Short mmCIF file of C-alpha atoms in Angstrom, two decimals:
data_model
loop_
_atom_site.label_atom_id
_atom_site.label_comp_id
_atom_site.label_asym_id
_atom_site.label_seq_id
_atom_site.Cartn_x
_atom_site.Cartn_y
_atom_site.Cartn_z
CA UNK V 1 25.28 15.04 7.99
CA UNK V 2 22.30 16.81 6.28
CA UNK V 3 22.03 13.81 3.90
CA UNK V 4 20.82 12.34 7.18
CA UNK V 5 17.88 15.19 8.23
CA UNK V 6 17.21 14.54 4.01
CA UNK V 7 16.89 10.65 4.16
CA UNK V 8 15.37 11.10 7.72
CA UNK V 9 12.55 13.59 6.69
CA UNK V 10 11.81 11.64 3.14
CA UNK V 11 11.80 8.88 5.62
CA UNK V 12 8.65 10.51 7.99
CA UNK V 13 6.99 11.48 4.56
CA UNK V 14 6.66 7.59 3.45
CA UNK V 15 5.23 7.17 7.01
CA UNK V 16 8.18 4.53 7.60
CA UNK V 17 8.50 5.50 11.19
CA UNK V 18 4.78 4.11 11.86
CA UNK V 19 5.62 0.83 9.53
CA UNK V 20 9.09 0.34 10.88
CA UNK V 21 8.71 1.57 14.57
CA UNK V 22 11.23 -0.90 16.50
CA UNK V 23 13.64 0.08 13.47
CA UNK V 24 13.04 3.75 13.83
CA UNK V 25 13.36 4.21 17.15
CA UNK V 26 17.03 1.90 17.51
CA UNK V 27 17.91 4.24 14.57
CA UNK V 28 17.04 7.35 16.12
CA UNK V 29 19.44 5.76 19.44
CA UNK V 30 22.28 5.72 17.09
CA UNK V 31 21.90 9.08 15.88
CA UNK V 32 21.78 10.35 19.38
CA UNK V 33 24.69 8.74 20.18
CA UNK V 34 26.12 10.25 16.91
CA UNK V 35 25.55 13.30 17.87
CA UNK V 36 27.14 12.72 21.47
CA UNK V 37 30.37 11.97 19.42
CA UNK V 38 30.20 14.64 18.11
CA UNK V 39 30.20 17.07 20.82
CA UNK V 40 32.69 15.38 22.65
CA UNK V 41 34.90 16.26 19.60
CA UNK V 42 34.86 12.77 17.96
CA UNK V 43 34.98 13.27 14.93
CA UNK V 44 36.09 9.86 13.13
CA UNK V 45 33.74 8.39 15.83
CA UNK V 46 30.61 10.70 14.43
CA UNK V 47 31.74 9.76 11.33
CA UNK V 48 31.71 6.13 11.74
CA UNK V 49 28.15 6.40 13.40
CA UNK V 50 27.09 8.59 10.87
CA UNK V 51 27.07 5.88 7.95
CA UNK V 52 25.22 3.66 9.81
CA UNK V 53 22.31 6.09 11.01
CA UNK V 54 22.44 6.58 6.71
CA UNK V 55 22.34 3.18 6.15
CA UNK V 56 19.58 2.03 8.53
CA UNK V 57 17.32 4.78 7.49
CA UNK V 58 17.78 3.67 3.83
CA UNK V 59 16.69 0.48 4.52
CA UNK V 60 13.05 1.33 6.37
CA UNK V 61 12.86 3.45 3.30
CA UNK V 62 13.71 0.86 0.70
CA UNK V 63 11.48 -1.89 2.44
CA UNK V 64 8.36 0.59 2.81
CA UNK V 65 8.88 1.31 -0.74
CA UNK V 66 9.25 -2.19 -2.11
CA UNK V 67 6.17 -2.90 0.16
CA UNK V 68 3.77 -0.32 -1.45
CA UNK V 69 4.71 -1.60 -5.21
CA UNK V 70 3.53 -4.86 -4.06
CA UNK V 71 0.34 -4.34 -2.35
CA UNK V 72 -0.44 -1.81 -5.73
CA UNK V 73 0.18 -4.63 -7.20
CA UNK V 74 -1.56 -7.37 -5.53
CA UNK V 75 -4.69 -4.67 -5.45
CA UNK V 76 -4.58 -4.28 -8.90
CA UNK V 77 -4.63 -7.73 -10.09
CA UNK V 78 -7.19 -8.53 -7.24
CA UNK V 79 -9.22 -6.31 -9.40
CA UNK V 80 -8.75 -7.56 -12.82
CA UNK V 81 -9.05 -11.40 -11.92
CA UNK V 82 -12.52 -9.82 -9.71
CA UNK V 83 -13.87 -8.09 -13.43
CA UNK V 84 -13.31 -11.51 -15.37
CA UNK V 85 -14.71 -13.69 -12.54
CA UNK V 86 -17.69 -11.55 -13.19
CA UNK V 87 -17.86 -12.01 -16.84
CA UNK V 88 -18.08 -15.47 -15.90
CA UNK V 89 -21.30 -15.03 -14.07
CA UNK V 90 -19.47 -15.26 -10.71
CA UNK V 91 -22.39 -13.53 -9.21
CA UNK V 92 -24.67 -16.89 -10.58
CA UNK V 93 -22.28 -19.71 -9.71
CA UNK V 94 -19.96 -18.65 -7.33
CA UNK V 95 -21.71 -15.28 -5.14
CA UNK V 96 -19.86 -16.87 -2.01
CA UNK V 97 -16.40 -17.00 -3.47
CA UNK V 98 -16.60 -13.36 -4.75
CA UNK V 99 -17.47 -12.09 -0.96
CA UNK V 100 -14.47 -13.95 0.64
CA UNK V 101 -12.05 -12.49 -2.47
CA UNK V 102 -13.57 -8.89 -1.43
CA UNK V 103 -13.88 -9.65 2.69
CA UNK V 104 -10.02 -10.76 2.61
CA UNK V 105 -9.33 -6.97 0.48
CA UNK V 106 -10.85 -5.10 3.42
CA UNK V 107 -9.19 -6.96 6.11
CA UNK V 108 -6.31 -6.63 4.69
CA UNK V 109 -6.81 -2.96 3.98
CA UNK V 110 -7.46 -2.42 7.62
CA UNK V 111 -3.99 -4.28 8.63
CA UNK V 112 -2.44 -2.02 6.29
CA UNK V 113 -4.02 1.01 7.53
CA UNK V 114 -2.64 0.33 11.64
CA UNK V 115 0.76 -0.04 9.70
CA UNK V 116 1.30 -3.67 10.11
CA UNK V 117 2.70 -3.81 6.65
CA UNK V 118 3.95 -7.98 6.72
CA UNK V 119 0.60 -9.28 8.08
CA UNK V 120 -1.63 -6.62 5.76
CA UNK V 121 0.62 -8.05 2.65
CA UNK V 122 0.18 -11.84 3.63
CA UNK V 123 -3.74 -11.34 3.45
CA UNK V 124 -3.65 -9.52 0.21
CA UNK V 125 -1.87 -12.68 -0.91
CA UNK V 126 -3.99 -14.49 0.03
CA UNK V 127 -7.46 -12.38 -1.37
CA UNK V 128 -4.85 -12.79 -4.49
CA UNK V 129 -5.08 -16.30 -4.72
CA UNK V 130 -8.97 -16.71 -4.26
CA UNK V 131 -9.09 -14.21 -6.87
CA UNK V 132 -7.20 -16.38 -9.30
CA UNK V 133 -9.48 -19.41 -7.80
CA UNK V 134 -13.01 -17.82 -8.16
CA UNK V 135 -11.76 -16.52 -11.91
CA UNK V 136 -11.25 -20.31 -12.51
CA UNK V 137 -13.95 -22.34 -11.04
CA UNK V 138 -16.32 -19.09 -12.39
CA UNK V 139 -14.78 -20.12 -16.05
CA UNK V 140 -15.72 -23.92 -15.43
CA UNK V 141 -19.00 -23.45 -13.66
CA UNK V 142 -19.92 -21.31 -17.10
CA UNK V 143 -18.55 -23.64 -19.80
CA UNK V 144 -20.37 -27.15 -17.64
CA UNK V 145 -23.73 -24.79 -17.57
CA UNK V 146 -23.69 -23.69 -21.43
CA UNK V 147 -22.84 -27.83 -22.18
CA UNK V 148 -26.17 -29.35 -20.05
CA UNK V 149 -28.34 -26.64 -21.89
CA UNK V 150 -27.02 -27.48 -25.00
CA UNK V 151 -27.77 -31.57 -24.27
CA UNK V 152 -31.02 -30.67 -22.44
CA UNK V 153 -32.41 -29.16 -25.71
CA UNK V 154 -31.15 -32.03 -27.85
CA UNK V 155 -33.37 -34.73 -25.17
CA UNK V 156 -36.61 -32.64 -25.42
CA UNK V 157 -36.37 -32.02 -29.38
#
């Protein structure tokens, strides 16, 4: 029973009431009727709530968690696809491409920051992808450039 106000508490602390909030409040339900049980004098009947209440905060926790790692990730690697777009002379070729990759970061940041964790992930993806894309085509637009200098000089000389 305190392993509950323990996982509850490092719960609140993750902010997985405000992700989670349907979840959180059917889980809270439970614990009140838990508690009920309890001072009726139901003690296997507490008991048997009890592990559930456990379990079902564990699980906001565990999703929140497993969450975060992946929009660190996806925020990270938005990054480093960003940098070698730009070593590509991104900002000559593709200018347009590198705006959508950032525009799609900060909407996505905002979904995240009114806790809608699914939709603010989905849009990260997606900023993800372009990333990848605009690295790419950035990459290609470079190389073609270099190659029609390199023929243009060899038709005027």
């Amino acid at each position: 029973l305190r392993d509950i106000k323990d996982i509850k508490n490092e719960l609140i602390r993750e902010r997985g009431h405000l992700f989670y909030s349907k979840e959180f409040n059917e889980a809270e339900r439970l614990e009140e009727a838990m508690k009920q049980s309890f001072s009726k004098k139901k003690a296997i009947e507490g008991n048997e709530i009890a592990l559930k209440v456990l379990e079902r905060y564990k699980t906001i926790i565990r999703e929140t968690r497993e969450k975060k790692e992946k929009t660190n990730y996806l925020k990270e690697n938005i990054e480093k696809y960003l940098n070698d777009a730009e070593a590509n002379e991104a900002y000559i070729w593709i200018p347009l491409e590198i705006d959508e990759v950032n525009n799609l970061y900060f909407e996505a940041t905002r979904k995240y920051k009114n806790y809608d964790l699914d939709n603010a992930l989905d849009m990260y993806s997606k900023a993800f992808n372009r990333a990848q894309q605009a690295a790419k085509n950035a990459k290609e637009a470079k190389a073609l450039k270099e190659t029609d200098e390199r023929m243009y000089k060899q038709l005027k000389a």
